[PDB]
Design an enzyme around this catalytic site. Structure first.
Site, PDB file in Angstrom:
ATOM      1  N   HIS A   1      37.814  33.456  49.253  1.00 24.44           N
ATOM      2  CA  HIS A   1      37.565  33.034  50.650  1.00 24.44           C
ATOM      3  C   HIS A   1      38.659  32.071  51.102  1.00 24.44           C
ATOM      4  CE1 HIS A   1      33.462  34.384  49.452  1.00 24.44           C
ATOM      5  NE2 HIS A   1      33.648  35.066  50.576  1.00 24.44           N
TER       6      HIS A   1
ATOM      7  N   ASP B   1      35.347  32.760  58.123  1.00 24.36           N
ATOM      8  CA  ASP B   1      35.085  32.023  56.853  1.00 24.36           C
ATOM      9  C   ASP B   1      35.722  30.615  56.859  1.00 24.36           C
ATOM     10  OD1 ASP B   1      33.399  33.691  55.263  1.00 24.36           O
ATOM     11  OD2 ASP B   1      35.126  34.959  54.739  1.00 24.36           O
TER      12      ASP B   1
ATOM     13  N   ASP C   1      34.397  42.868  56.215  1.00 23.44           N
ATOM     14  CA  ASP C   1      34.032  41.812  55.242  1.00 23.44           C
ATOM     15  C   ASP C   1      33.675  42.442  53.895  1.00 23.44           C
ATOM     16  OD1 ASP C   1      33.978  39.027  54.854  1.00 23.44           O
ATOM     17  OD2 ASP C   1      31.782  38.907  55.174  1.00 23.44           O
TER      18      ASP C   1
END
Ligand SMILES: CCCCNC(=O)C#Cc1cc(C2=NN(C3CCCCCC3)C(=O)[C@@H]3CCCC[C@H]23)ccc1OC
Ligand SMILES: [Mg+2]
Ligand SMILES: [Zn+2]
Length: 333
Positions: free
Chosen positions: A84, A125, A237
Protein backbone atom coordinates in the site's frame (compact mmCIF):
# COMPACT_ATOMS: atom_id res chain seq x y z
CA UNK A 1 0.24 21.07 3.23
CA UNK A 2 3.25 23.08 1.80
CA UNK A 3 2.86 24.10 -1.87
CA UNK A 4 4.67 22.06 -4.54
CA UNK A 5 8.02 23.55 -5.79
CA UNK A 6 8.95 24.25 -9.50
CA UNK A 7 11.98 21.93 -8.72
CA UNK A 8 9.66 19.00 -7.70
CA UNK A 9 7.47 19.41 -10.88
CA UNK A 10 10.72 19.60 -13.00
CA UNK A 11 11.94 16.33 -11.33
CA UNK A 12 8.77 14.62 -12.82
CA UNK A 13 8.48 16.38 -16.24
CA UNK A 14 12.03 15.25 -17.20
CA UNK A 15 10.99 11.56 -17.23
CA UNK A 16 10.25 10.37 -20.80
CA UNK A 17 9.44 6.65 -20.21
CA UNK A 18 11.30 5.35 -23.34
CA UNK A 19 9.36 2.43 -25.01
CA UNK A 20 6.78 2.10 -22.15
CA UNK A 21 3.14 2.31 -23.37
CA UNK A 22 1.18 3.32 -20.19
CA UNK A 23 -2.19 2.63 -21.93
CA UNK A 24 -1.41 -1.09 -22.57
CA UNK A 25 -2.83 -4.01 -20.48
CA UNK A 26 0.67 -5.63 -20.58
CA UNK A 27 2.24 -2.47 -19.06
CA UNK A 28 4.79 -3.31 -16.31
CA UNK A 29 5.27 -0.84 -13.40
CA UNK A 30 8.10 -3.03 -11.93
CA UNK A 31 10.24 -2.76 -15.19
CA UNK A 32 9.38 1.02 -15.08
CA UNK A 33 10.51 1.43 -11.41
CA UNK A 34 13.96 -0.19 -12.13
CA UNK A 35 14.51 1.55 -15.54
CA UNK A 36 15.78 4.58 -13.47
CA UNK A 37 17.02 5.16 -9.86
CA UNK A 38 14.26 7.85 -9.33
CA UNK A 39 11.44 5.26 -9.15
CA UNK A 40 9.04 7.84 -7.51
CA UNK A 41 9.45 10.55 -10.25
CA UNK A 42 8.76 7.80 -12.88
CA UNK A 43 5.51 6.72 -11.03
CA UNK A 44 4.40 10.42 -10.89
CA UNK A 45 5.11 10.78 -14.65
CA UNK A 46 3.11 7.61 -15.54
CA UNK A 47 0.15 9.12 -13.55
CA UNK A 48 0.62 12.59 -15.22
CA UNK A 49 0.85 11.02 -18.72
CA UNK A 50 -2.26 8.79 -18.14
CA UNK A 51 -4.33 11.81 -16.93
CA UNK A 52 -3.33 14.15 -19.85
CA UNK A 53 -3.63 11.45 -22.59
CA UNK A 54 -7.26 10.79 -21.43
CA UNK A 55 -7.88 14.45 -22.47
CA UNK A 56 -10.15 14.79 -19.36
CA UNK A 57 -8.24 17.28 -17.10
CA UNK A 58 -8.31 19.89 -19.98
CA UNK A 59 -12.10 19.49 -20.53
CA UNK A 60 -12.69 20.26 -16.76
CA UNK A 61 -10.48 23.40 -16.51
CA UNK A 62 -7.63 21.58 -14.70
CA UNK A 63 -4.27 23.12 -15.80
CA UNK A 64 -1.24 20.79 -16.36
CA UNK A 65 0.33 22.56 -13.32
CA UNK A 66 -2.61 21.95 -10.87
CA UNK A 67 -2.74 18.29 -12.11
CA UNK A 68 0.98 17.74 -11.31
CA UNK A 69 0.68 19.53 -7.90
CA UNK A 70 -2.22 17.15 -7.03
CA UNK A 71 -0.20 14.03 -8.07
CA UNK A 72 2.76 15.21 -5.87
CA UNK A 73 0.56 16.20 -2.89
CA UNK A 74 -0.85 12.60 -3.12
CA UNK A 75 2.68 11.01 -3.44
CA UNK A 76 3.96 12.82 -0.26
CA UNK A 77 1.18 11.20 1.84
CA UNK A 78 2.05 7.55 0.86
CA UNK A 79 4.50 5.55 2.99
CA UNK A 80 7.42 3.13 2.60
CA UNK A 81 5.36 -0.11 3.17
CA UNK A 82 5.70 -3.24 0.94
CA UNK A 83 2.31 -2.93 -0.95
CA UNK A 84 0.00 0.00 0.00
CA UNK A 85 2.59 2.54 -1.25
CA UNK A 86 2.45 5.04 -4.20
CA UNK A 87 3.29 2.29 -6.79
CA UNK A 88 0.05 0.45 -5.79
CA UNK A 89 -2.23 3.51 -6.41
CA UNK A 90 -0.37 4.39 -9.70
CA UNK A 91 -0.99 0.71 -10.67
CA UNK A 92 -4.75 1.11 -9.80
CA UNK A 93 -4.85 4.37 -11.85
CA UNK A 94 -3.18 2.67 -14.91
CA UNK A 95 -5.35 -0.47 -14.58
CA UNK A 96 -8.55 1.69 -14.38
CA UNK A 97 -7.40 3.56 -17.56
CA UNK A 98 -7.22 0.14 -19.37
CA UNK A 99 -10.70 -0.96 -18.04
CA UNK A 100 -12.21 2.38 -19.20
CA UNK A 101 -10.40 2.72 -22.61
CA UNK A 102 -9.37 -0.88 -23.64
CA UNK A 103 -12.45 -2.46 -21.89
CA UNK A 104 -14.83 0.27 -23.25
CA UNK A 105 -16.27 0.88 -19.71
CA UNK A 106 -15.96 4.66 -20.60
CA UNK A 107 -19.22 4.08 -22.63
CA UNK A 108 -21.10 3.48 -19.30
CA UNK A 109 -19.97 6.81 -17.66
CA UNK A 110 -19.74 10.60 -18.31
CA UNK A 111 -16.32 12.16 -19.00
CA UNK A 112 -16.53 13.72 -15.48
CA UNK A 113 -17.03 10.21 -13.94
CA UNK A 114 -14.03 8.91 -16.03
CA UNK A 115 -12.00 11.92 -14.73
CA UNK A 116 -13.12 11.36 -11.09
CA UNK A 117 -12.22 7.59 -11.27
CA UNK A 118 -8.65 8.19 -12.58
CA UNK A 119 -8.18 10.88 -9.82
CA UNK A 120 -9.79 8.68 -7.09
CA UNK A 121 -7.29 5.86 -7.93
CA UNK A 122 -4.47 8.10 -6.61
CA UNK A 123 -6.19 9.10 -3.24
CA UNK A 124 -7.82 5.66 -2.42
CA UNK A 125 -5.10 4.43 0.08
CA UNK A 126 -3.57 7.80 1.34
CA UNK A 127 -1.36 7.42 4.48
CA UNK A 128 -1.78 3.59 4.62
CA UNK A 129 0.50 2.21 7.38
CA UNK A 130 0.51 -1.47 6.20
CA UNK A 131 -2.14 -2.52 8.80
CA UNK A 132 -5.76 -3.54 7.95
CA UNK A 133 -8.98 -2.27 9.68
CA UNK A 134 -9.07 -5.37 11.97
CA UNK A 135 -5.65 -4.47 13.47
CA UNK A 136 -6.81 -0.99 14.69
CA UNK A 137 -10.00 -2.46 16.29
CA UNK A 138 -8.40 -5.59 17.93
CA UNK A 139 -5.65 -3.44 19.50
CA UNK A 140 -8.11 -0.73 20.70
CA UNK A 141 -5.86 1.86 18.99
CA UNK A 142 -6.89 5.57 18.92
CA UNK A 143 -8.08 5.47 15.25
CA UNK A 144 -9.99 2.24 16.09
CA UNK A 145 -11.74 3.84 19.12
CA UNK A 146 -12.71 6.92 17.05
CA UNK A 147 -14.17 4.69 14.28
CA UNK A 148 -16.07 2.57 16.83
CA UNK A 149 -17.25 5.67 18.77
CA UNK A 150 -18.49 7.46 15.60
CA UNK A 151 -20.20 4.34 14.16
CA UNK A 152 -18.06 3.72 11.04
CA UNK A 153 -16.16 0.37 10.89
CA UNK A 154 -14.18 1.46 7.75
CA UNK A 155 -11.22 2.88 9.77
CA UNK A 156 -8.70 3.32 6.91
CA UNK A 157 -11.17 4.28 4.12
CA UNK A 158 -12.61 7.24 6.16
CA UNK A 159 -8.94 8.26 6.94
CA UNK A 160 -8.11 8.19 3.15
CA UNK A 161 -11.18 10.39 2.36
CA UNK A 162 -10.17 12.87 5.10
CA UNK A 163 -6.72 13.36 3.48
CA UNK A 164 -8.29 13.55 0.00
CA UNK A 165 -10.53 16.55 0.89
CA UNK A 166 -7.52 18.22 2.64
CA UNK A 167 -5.47 18.16 -0.61
CA UNK A 168 -8.42 19.43 -2.75
CA UNK A 169 -9.22 22.30 -0.30
CA UNK A 170 -6.16 24.18 -1.69
CA UNK A 171 -6.90 25.62 -5.21
CA UNK A 172 -3.26 24.92 -6.37
CA UNK A 173 -3.91 21.12 -6.09
CA UNK A 174 -7.73 21.00 -6.58
CA UNK A 175 -8.17 19.10 -9.90
CA UNK A 176 -11.94 19.94 -9.38
CA UNK A 177 -11.51 23.78 -9.03
CA UNK A 178 -12.87 24.05 -12.64
CA UNK A 179 -16.18 22.51 -11.40
CA UNK A 180 -19.10 24.33 -9.68
CA UNK A 181 -22.59 23.48 -8.34
CA UNK A 182 -23.93 19.98 -9.12
CA UNK A 183 -20.72 18.85 -10.96
CA UNK A 184 -18.34 19.77 -8.06
CA UNK A 185 -20.75 18.04 -5.61
CA UNK A 186 -20.91 14.91 -7.87
CA UNK A 187 -17.07 14.82 -8.13
CA UNK A 188 -16.60 14.84 -4.30
CA UNK A 189 -19.57 12.54 -3.47
CA UNK A 190 -18.46 9.93 -6.13
CA UNK A 191 -14.74 10.07 -5.14
CA UNK A 192 -15.78 9.49 -1.48
CA UNK A 193 -18.42 6.75 -2.24
CA UNK A 194 -15.76 4.85 -4.37
CA UNK A 195 -13.02 4.99 -1.62
CA UNK A 196 -15.55 3.85 1.06
CA UNK A 197 -16.55 0.97 -1.30
CA UNK A 198 -12.88 -0.37 -1.35
CA UNK A 199 -13.39 -1.80 2.22
CA UNK A 200 -13.44 -5.58 1.47
CA UNK A 201 -15.91 -6.05 4.40
CA UNK A 202 -18.53 -4.59 1.92
CA UNK A 203 -17.27 -6.73 -1.07
CA UNK A 204 -20.31 -9.10 -1.17
CA UNK A 205 -22.99 -6.38 -0.81
CA UNK A 206 -21.32 -3.94 -3.34
CA UNK A 207 -21.02 -6.78 -5.94
CA UNK A 208 -24.70 -7.90 -5.40
CA UNK A 209 -25.99 -4.25 -5.60
CA UNK A 210 -24.12 -3.60 -8.90
CA UNK A 211 -25.38 -6.97 -10.38
CA UNK A 212 -29.07 -6.33 -9.33
CA UNK A 213 -28.85 -2.80 -10.89
CA UNK A 214 -27.20 -4.00 -14.20
CA UNK A 215 -29.93 -6.72 -14.49
CA UNK A 216 -32.73 -4.04 -13.99
CA UNK A 217 -33.48 -1.98 -17.19
CA UNK A 218 -35.50 0.34 -14.83
CA UNK A 219 -32.61 0.92 -12.35
CA UNK A 220 -32.19 4.58 -11.41
CA UNK A 221 -29.54 5.79 -13.93
CA UNK A 222 -27.59 8.04 -11.43
CA UNK A 223 -27.43 5.05 -8.99
CA UNK A 224 -26.20 2.70 -11.82
CA UNK A 225 -23.43 5.19 -12.75
CA UNK A 226 -22.39 5.41 -9.05
CA UNK A 227 -22.26 1.63 -8.59
CA UNK A 228 -20.33 1.32 -11.92
CA UNK A 229 -17.69 3.78 -10.51
CA UNK A 230 -17.50 1.83 -7.19
CA UNK A 231 -17.20 -1.52 -9.06
CA UNK A 232 -14.42 -0.16 -11.35
CA UNK A 233 -12.36 1.17 -8.40
CA UNK A 234 -12.88 -2.19 -6.62
CA UNK A 235 -11.90 -4.01 -9.89
CA UNK A 236 -8.58 -2.06 -10.10
CA UNK A 237 -7.95 -2.62 -6.37
CA UNK A 238 -8.05 -6.48 -6.83
CA UNK A 239 -6.57 -6.43 -10.45
CA UNK A 240 -3.15 -7.94 -9.49
CA UNK A 241 -4.26 -11.47 -10.67
CA UNK A 242 -5.43 -10.02 -14.13
CA UNK A 243 -1.80 -9.05 -15.05
CA UNK A 244 0.85 -11.14 -16.87
CA UNK A 245 1.95 -13.96 -14.46
CA UNK A 246 5.38 -12.45 -13.43
CA UNK A 247 3.77 -9.02 -12.65
CA UNK A 248 0.94 -10.81 -10.69
CA UNK A 249 3.63 -12.83 -8.78
CA UNK A 250 5.67 -9.75 -7.74
CA UNK A 251 2.41 -8.09 -6.46
CA UNK A 252 1.55 -11.31 -4.50
CA UNK A 253 5.11 -11.18 -2.96
CA UNK A 254 4.68 -7.53 -1.88
CA UNK A 255 1.23 -8.13 -0.30
CA UNK A 256 2.33 -11.32 1.51
CA UNK A 257 5.25 -9.46 3.13
CA UNK A 258 2.96 -6.61 4.27
CA UNK A 259 0.57 -9.19 5.84
CA UNK A 260 3.57 -10.96 7.49
CA UNK A 261 4.72 -7.66 9.17
CA UNK A 262 1.16 -6.99 10.50
CA UNK A 263 1.26 -10.51 12.11
CA UNK A 264 4.78 -9.73 13.57
CA UNK A 265 3.30 -6.66 15.40
CA UNK A 266 0.08 -8.53 16.32
CA UNK A 267 2.48 -11.05 17.91
CA UNK A 268 4.45 -8.48 19.95
CA UNK A 269 1.12 -6.90 20.99
CA UNK A 270 -0.44 -10.21 22.07
CA UNK A 271 -3.46 -10.12 19.73
CA UNK A 272 -5.09 -12.83 17.53
CA UNK A 273 -2.82 -13.59 14.44
CA UNK A 274 -4.65 -15.22 11.43
CA UNK A 275 -2.82 -17.98 9.41
CA UNK A 276 -2.56 -15.51 6.44
CA UNK A 277 -0.39 -13.05 8.56
CA UNK A 278 1.86 -15.73 10.21
CA UNK A 279 5.41 -16.17 8.76
CA UNK A 280 5.63 -19.37 10.91
CA UNK A 281 2.82 -21.04 8.90
CA UNK A 282 5.10 -20.53 5.80
CA UNK A 283 2.20 -21.16 3.36
CA UNK A 284 2.86 -21.61 -0.40
CA UNK A 285 2.21 -18.49 -2.60
CA UNK A 286 0.74 -20.94 -5.19
CA UNK A 287 -2.02 -22.16 -2.80
CA UNK A 288 -2.62 -18.52 -1.64
CA UNK A 289 -3.09 -17.09 -5.17
CA UNK A 290 -5.25 -20.12 -6.23
CA UNK A 291 -7.34 -19.42 -3.07
CA UNK A 292 -7.74 -15.68 -3.85
CA UNK A 293 -8.56 -16.59 -7.50
CA UNK A 294 -11.23 -19.20 -6.53
CA UNK A 295 -12.99 -17.35 -3.63
CA UNK A 296 -12.60 -13.59 -4.59
CA UNK A 297 -11.17 -12.54 -8.02
CA UNK A 298 -12.54 -15.11 -10.57
CA UNK A 299 -16.23 -14.95 -9.46
CA UNK A 300 -15.97 -11.09 -9.22
CA UNK A 301 -14.53 -10.49 -12.72
CA UNK A 302 -16.68 -13.24 -14.35
CA UNK A 303 -19.95 -11.83 -12.88
CA UNK A 304 -19.32 -8.13 -13.85
CA UNK A 305 -18.16 -9.08 -17.40
CA UNK A 306 -21.23 -11.38 -17.83
CA UNK A 307 -23.64 -8.84 -16.29
CA UNK A 308 -22.44 -5.75 -18.11
CA UNK A 309 -18.69 -5.11 -18.74
CA UNK A 310 -18.25 -7.44 -21.78
CA UNK A 311 -15.17 -5.51 -23.00
CA UNK A 312 -13.23 -6.64 -19.87
CA UNK A 313 -13.29 -10.40 -20.90
CA UNK A 314 -9.42 -10.38 -20.99
CA UNK A 315 -9.33 -10.08 -17.14
CA UNK A 316 -11.23 -13.42 -16.90
CA UNK A 317 -8.86 -15.02 -19.55
CA UNK A 318 -5.69 -13.84 -17.66
CA UNK A 319 -7.07 -15.04 -14.25
CA UNK A 320 -7.88 -18.45 -15.88
CA UNK A 321 -4.29 -18.70 -17.29
CA UNK A 322 -2.66 -17.40 -14.03
CA UNK A 323 -4.48 -20.18 -12.07
CA UNK A 324 -3.25 -22.80 -14.67
CA UNK A 325 0.36 -21.60 -14.17
CA UNK A 326 0.07 -21.83 -10.28
CA UNK A 327 -1.45 -25.35 -10.71
CA UNK A 328 1.76 -26.24 -12.72
CA UNK A 329 4.01 -24.85 -9.90
CA UNK A 330 2.09 -27.34 -7.65
CA UNK A 331 2.09 -30.21 -10.20
CA UNK A 332 5.97 -30.01 -10.58
CA UNK A 333 6.87 -29.45 -6.84
C1 LIG B 1 -7.94 -15.97 0.54
C2 LIG B 1 -6.70 -15.45 -0.15
C3 LIG B 1 -5.43 -15.73 0.62
C4 LIG B 1 -4.48 -14.54 0.64
N1 LIG B 1 -3.14 -14.89 0.18
C5 LIG B 1 -2.67 -14.46 -1.01
O1 LIG B 1 -1.91 -15.11 -1.72
C6 LIG B 1 -3.09 -13.17 -1.43
C7 LIG B 1 -3.49 -12.08 -1.72
C8 LIG B 1 -4.01 -10.78 -2.01
C9 LIG B 1 -4.88 -10.15 -1.12
C10 LIG B 1 -5.38 -8.89 -1.40
C11 LIG B 1 -6.31 -8.21 -0.45
N2 LIG B 1 -6.87 -8.95 0.45
N3 LIG B 1 -7.85 -8.37 1.19
C12 LIG B 1 -8.88 -9.28 1.73
C13 LIG B 1 -9.66 -9.99 0.63
C14 LIG B 1 -10.80 -10.87 1.13
C15 LIG B 1 -10.40 -12.29 1.42
C16 LIG B 1 -9.54 -12.45 2.65
C17 LIG B 1 -9.31 -11.17 3.41
C18 LIG B 1 -8.29 -10.24 2.77
C19 LIG B 1 -7.93 -7.03 1.44
O2 LIG B 1 -8.81 -6.58 2.16
C20 LIG B 1 -6.91 -6.15 0.80
C21 LIG B 1 -7.35 -4.69 0.74
C22 LIG B 1 -8.26 -4.42 -0.41
C23 LIG B 1 -8.25 -5.13 -1.51
C24 LIG B 1 -7.64 -6.48 -1.62
C25 LIG B 1 -6.55 -6.73 -0.59
C26 LIG B 1 -5.02 -8.25 -2.58
C27 LIG B 1 -4.16 -8.86 -3.47
C28 LIG B 1 -3.65 -10.12 -3.20
O3 LIG B 1 -2.79 -10.80 -4.03
C29 LIG B 1 -2.03 -10.05 -4.97
MG1 LIG C 1 -7.43 0.35 0.69
ZN1 LIG D 1 -5.80 -0.12 -2.80
Amino acid sequence: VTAITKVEREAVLVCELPSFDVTDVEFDLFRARESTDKPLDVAAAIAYRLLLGSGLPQKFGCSDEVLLNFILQCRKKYRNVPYHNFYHVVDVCQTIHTFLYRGNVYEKLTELECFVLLITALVHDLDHMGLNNSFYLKTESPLGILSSASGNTSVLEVHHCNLAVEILSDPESDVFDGLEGAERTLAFRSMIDCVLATDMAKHGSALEAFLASAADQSSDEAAFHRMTMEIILKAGDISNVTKPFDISRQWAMAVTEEFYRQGDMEKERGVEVLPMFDRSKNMELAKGQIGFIDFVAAPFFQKIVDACLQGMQWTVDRIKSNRAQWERVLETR
